Design a protein around this ligand. Structure first.
Ligand SMILES: *[C@@H]1O[C@H](CO)[C@@H](O[C@@H]2O[C@H](CO)[C@@H](O)[C@H](O)[C@H]2NC(C)=O)[C@H](O)[C@H]1NC(C)=O
Ligand SMILES: *[C@@H]1O[C@H](CO)[C@@H](O[C@@H]2O[C@H](CO)[C@@H](O)[C@H](O)[C@H]2NC(C)=O)[C@H](O)[C@H]1NC(C)=O
Ligand code: NAG
Ligand code: NAG
Ligand code: CA
Ligand code: CA
Ligand code: CA
Ligand code: CA
Ligand code: CU
Ligand code: CU
Lengths: 704, 699
């Protein structure tokens, strides 16, 4: 079955679904890029992933491929009871039908306040701030901040305190040219209430300046002019790090460069990457972000899907913005906020780079150039090696080379790096880095219970990062069990001197039967060897397994006591294994960010006391850390040590190490000529086999 | 300025001629020595005292005498001792002092002494000439017996059960040609007693065949010939993996190759690496293994010393050899058992490669070619990046390049990989990988409580690996404190709507004042942020710090209840911080392997309830994992996912990211020509002309 079922929609296919929806949605249908709250609107159109039954029927058993469909989110603002609605639209490329799956999926209409804040909304909010509200305090603002074209606004987190609220705290910052404005908070923060569908009716519920609450910007300017406010002059320009990214040092000799001496050893065709060892499909959800499907090692499928589900950032702090802030980044979109990869910085210069197409908050499809990069990377390490000077004189090794796919999501200040790396041993590593700029507060007072001073007038606010992954392993077929292997010591008499005691080392295997048993809380310890496995077995008779191996420094999760916690229930777990249902496609939702108190998807609902003894299983992995900012996070947070993710590793899945059969392996005996070419491939790189290519002239995918 | 350089070949011959002429005649070469002889076991660099060394490197003083330390086996006397002697000054030695007593308070029992290469050879003459033909009937019928040329022997762990013992279990294995013999256990294990100083007197305390215990080989042969022993014939050759390393698949298009477009960006002179950012010295102890001294980031020193102290492997199993085995690898030697790096496999092809000289168990100095490699590696990752489509249109980042130093020690089956990697952010990563062959048993019976079947007739025995590192951080001078930062949530009324509650996130700092508070047991949780710091502060007024960040999947340590456990008490700790003394230079010792019950050094003695508030500190980091072998370990165990170690990371130590001032940084704005060469270095013969391949050879 040779189709590309998992490919993100092309631009024709988006135009096609747009044309279709235009014609059929009633007249009065506004473009989303200019829409007001009471308008109608196509928010999003993206690929609707196919149901698994049908997909595998095609891929494995040759049946016809399932209708390729799209899913549009529609803001219905023009009516007595405004709803959000999800509609499926197919088949592609010539759509002929549309049904409204909203009720059928979340049992009821979608409250209109759950909708993401549109780009027009943010723009209206700024008209309200800069034109109507902020000149009421123009005296204060001359005095402190060089006064509304030099200042600039930034959003927060959940918007309110209570299901249905839509009130956001907004920070104010100097509009720094050519570097991060995120460091130069001016101390002013405005709780805006924009729940109403008429922007004229929008209020400013509270105000916060340098330590103090006020009821309005008027009453702040009353108190300023009455001489009753100690105001702090915050510089406006400066130099190095806090103000720049451009290094003052001039370029020196060049760093090392990697090249393929005789052509590449893989190919990308559409959504499908293929190599001597690995074959897989890849994509970005608009909200979910990265994903790969149909991963096959030497022709056998290991995983149906691996895909980011959510990223979280829980903050604390002095100011109301920082202590309210819980970003659920799916609500903005890890795909929407993807950004071009800059060649030679984000991936190796000779990597192959791929575009990504999308239709969000517009009516034309746009394209993000160089959104993904795929490459083979020599790691420096040997994968494996042994040198025998003992009894027999030989050497046998293999340098590890690895296959890689990378996107980067720039969510305001943060640049998330998402890596999916494919080892020649049959292992799959998922990785998640955070760089970019820190979300900062204005430095004031009881600092230190809440973070570190990091520049003049700048607090680095404490926060946690957590991220969720879905790992739908299909280990040797759909029917899988989970096993927990570990270890134990048993006091025993030494057999041949019973007078003497010895501490006896033993393996421990428990087969986990129920969802509740394989759900592991953050804080609880957890089996050293945990793997999903098969009815089937390898040559020596052990169940065929793939083994999850985590890499987390997890923060304490937001306590359960909180009304908000439900919107990201998944943070509380390290790992959970679950019966994989069509009704349960995802862990979070775009709709949880703006109403986590009545969550649109609640992940703890999935762990519900069913068997996981021989069913189609799906593993859910949380990974993250705590981050007390510090001075070396200026200008940017750095990758080193901040890799988090997991390994999927073979455990009695094969009969031997597949890399035994590698084309790149190296062997020689003591009695051989190790530097003769017929014995050793490495002895010909010099003779002839050299010659770095001419390079492609540099290009860049641009900006908005 | 080369205080820390391992001894040259001249300097070894020099100490060896000096020791010859002054040790009494009757002084035998160690390679040939019998237990009752006298013997120079080792001569290696004696590291200088820290007061004096710093005096020299910082304050201009003259250098401390360059000295050597020789271990001498004094077997020819009424009470035989082992003795460590300092010998100086170099390169013209004129003195020699016996530090043994002054260091471990008394003589060194002769049984603590490492099993020499001649001892292993004598044990094999006993085994194959006197003992094994007593059972040539069984061995014809099970293992193709020829008079012992087809079989082969391998050591175990501590030797005996009790302080003073010297009785070693030995497994038998087919002598596979050109691939690891370690997978072909024949089922036979002999407890040999070799304590005596007269090899004629050596006994065979016990025997183990195929699940059952016998008192000698004669008795097993009685029981065999009586038809009373079910014998199975174990094949002798075979194909693929379990029997080979050579891939059957022909070489394909070549893998990616890294080269330096306009020459290297570092240099190696003797023991000293130098680069644009980093400057350090490097070496191997003979027993302790890798180490680096005088690490200087942009000229300021961060660490005095980082050094491997010990590697440990605890096993379990069906058979006596497996369940008795706890290898303390220092007792063999991580430096001795270092092996040449094979260019293009163990390190980048274009890396620079350095020799190592040693003098152990001989009288001439030998050399291990290509023992170290140093290289710059482009990682493919960015060190950092931001892309702004928001309010202002710009891009600013930096691909991470890294500097690396690597040695590999092959201890029998196991190939340990030791890495020291130097990030341009000011971080140092220490890494430890294990590859090579698994140590295997013969498959019989109750398997499964004890490991996995992994080939025909081969059990992969469960085991833990752990390793110990000494990290002598000198954060902004000698006086350091340690701090433990972490996090907490505090229920609080929302200020601006107090009828609602909010879970308020807060940092948590405690300054650890006592050694007991900064020693962290395996099992117990540990502060998310834990760093050594200074009196001094950065611009913003935070204490200047380096943070330790571990990477361990610890095995359960050997229980305390065990008589053996003191010989590696560092296994029970994740991390310990400690007043740094000259009487406490190391964590284990070469003498612990052969007598852990009366440990020659016991690490828990260092954690002794002193203050660590503003003292010269040292951190000790344990790292390791559990290994239940599995089919994908044949023919070798793979590196993937098996990296363990730690990061040493700036924490308010600088005023900003030093990489901000990087030469290889990249910046451009929306309104610029991103592909014009004057804006972007990335927008600009017959490249690598490669050295013809060579190899360091074998014994
Ligand atoms: C959500 O909104 C849409 C319209 O704004 C509702 O769908 C319409 O329903 C009426 C009568 O029920 C039909 O005659 C229209 O033609 C429908 N339009 C479409 C395209 O679906 C919808 O029922 C509302 N859903 C809920 C449950 O609130
Ligand atoms: C270990 O043995 C050595 C020699 O077998 C001892 O060293 C000698 O000590 C005698 C006096 O007891 C001196 O006269 C010799 O000149 C010494 N030789 C050297 C090179 O030291 C040593 O005393 C023994 N160590 C202990 C602690 O017993
Ligand atoms: C912010 O700064 C940039 C200059 O790079 C400018 O183009 C933009 O118009 C400024 N003003 C605001 C309020 O966004
Ligand atoms: C073992 O086999 C090797 C080569 O395969 C041989 O050279 C050696 O001498 C043999 N005998 C022993 C016991 O070492
Ligand atoms: Ca369920
Ligand atoms: Ca599955
Ligand atoms: Ca102490
Ligand atoms: Ca120190
Ligand atoms: Cu962060
Ligand atoms: Cu192991």
């Amino acid at each position: 079955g040779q189709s590309q079922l998992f490919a993100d929609l092309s631009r024709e296919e988006l135009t096609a679904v747009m044309r279709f929806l235009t014609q059929r949605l009633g007249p009065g249908l506004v473009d989303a890029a200019q829409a007001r709250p009471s308008d109608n609107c196509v928010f999003s159109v993206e690929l609707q992933l196919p149901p698994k039954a049908a997909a595998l029927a095609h891929l494995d058993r040759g049946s016809p491929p399932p209708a390729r469909e799209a899913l549009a989110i529609v803001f219905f603002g023009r009516q007595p009871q405004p709803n959000v609605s999800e509609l499926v639209v197919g088949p592609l490329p010539h759509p002929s039908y549309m049904r409204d799956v909203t009720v059928e999926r979340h049992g009821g209409p979608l409250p209109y306040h759950r909708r993401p804040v549109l780009f027009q909304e943010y723009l209206d909010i700024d008209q309200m701030i800069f034109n109507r509200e902020l000149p009421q305090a123009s005296g204060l603002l001359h005095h402190c901040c060089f006064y509304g074209r030099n200042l600039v606004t930034m959003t927060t987190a959940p918007r309110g305190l209570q299901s249905g609220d839509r009130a956001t705290w907004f920070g104010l910052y100097y509009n720094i040219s050519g570097a991060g404005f995120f460091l130069h908070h001016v101390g002013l923060e405005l709780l805006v209430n924009h729940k109403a569908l008429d922007p004229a009716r929008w209020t400013i519920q509270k105000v916060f300046y340098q330590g103090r609450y006020y009821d309005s910007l008027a009453q702040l300017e009353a108190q300023f002019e009455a001489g009753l406010v100690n105001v702090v002059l915050i510089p406006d320009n400066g130099t190095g790090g806090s103000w720049s990214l451009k290094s003052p040092v001039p370029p020196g000799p060049a760093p090392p460069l990697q090249f393929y001496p005789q052509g590449p050893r893989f190919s990308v065709q559409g959504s499908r990457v293929a190599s001597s060892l690995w074959t897989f499909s890849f994509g970005l959800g608009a909200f979910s972000g990265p994903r790969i499907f149909d991963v096959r090692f030497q022709g056998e499928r290991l995983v149906y899907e691996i895909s980011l589900q959510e990223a979280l950032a829980i903050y604390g702090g002095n100011s109301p913005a920082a202590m309210t802030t819980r970003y659920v980044d799916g609500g903005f979109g890890m795909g929407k906020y993807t950004t071009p990869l800059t060649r030679g910085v984000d991936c190796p210069y000779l990597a192959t780079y791929v575009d990504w197409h999308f239709l969000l908050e517009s009516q034309a499809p746009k394209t993000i150039r160089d959104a993904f990069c795929v490459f083979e990377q020599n790691q420096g390490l040997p994968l494996r090696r042994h040198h025998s000077d003992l009894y027999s004189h030989y050497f046998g090794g293999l340098a590890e080379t690895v296959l890689v796919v990378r996107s980067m999501s720039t969510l305001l200040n943060y640049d998330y790096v998402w890596d999916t790396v494919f080892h020649p041993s049959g292992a799959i590593e998922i990785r998640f880095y955070a760089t970019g700029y820190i979300s900062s507060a204005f430095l004031f007072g009881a600092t230190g219970k809440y973070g570190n001073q990091v520049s003049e007038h700048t607090l680095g606010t404490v926060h946690t990062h957590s991220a969720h992954f879905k790992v739908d392993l299909d280990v040797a077929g759909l029917e899988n069990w989970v096993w927990a292997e570990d270890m134990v010591f048993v006091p025993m008499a030494v057999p041949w001197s019973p007078e003497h005691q010895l501490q006896r080392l033993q393996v421990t295997r428990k087969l986990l039967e129920m969802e509740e048993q394989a759900a592991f809380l953050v804080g609880s310890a957890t089996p050293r060897y945990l793997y999903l496995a098969s009815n089937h077995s390898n040559k020596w008779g052990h169940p065929r397994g793939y083994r999850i191996q985590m890499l987390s420094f997890a923060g304490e999760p937001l306590p359960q006591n909180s009304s908000m916690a439900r919107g990201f229930s998944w943070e509380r777990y390290q790992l959970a294994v679950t019966q994989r249902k069509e009704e349960e496609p995802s862990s979070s939702s775009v709709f949880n960010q703006n109403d986590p108190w009545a969550p649109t998807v609640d992940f703890s609902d999935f762990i519900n006391n069913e068997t996981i003894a021989g069913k189609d299983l799906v593993a859910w992995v949380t990974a993250g850390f705590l981050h007390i900012p510090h001075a070396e996070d200026i200008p940017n947070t750095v990758t080193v040590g901040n890799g988090v993710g997991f390994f999927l590793r073979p455990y009695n899945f094969f009969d031997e190490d597949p890399s035994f059969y590698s084309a790149d392996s190296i062997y020689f005996r003591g009695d051989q000529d190790a530097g003769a070419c017929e014995v050793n491939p490495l002895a010909c790189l010099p003779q002839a086999a050299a010659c770095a290519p001419d390079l492609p002239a540099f290009s860049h995918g641009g900006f908005s």
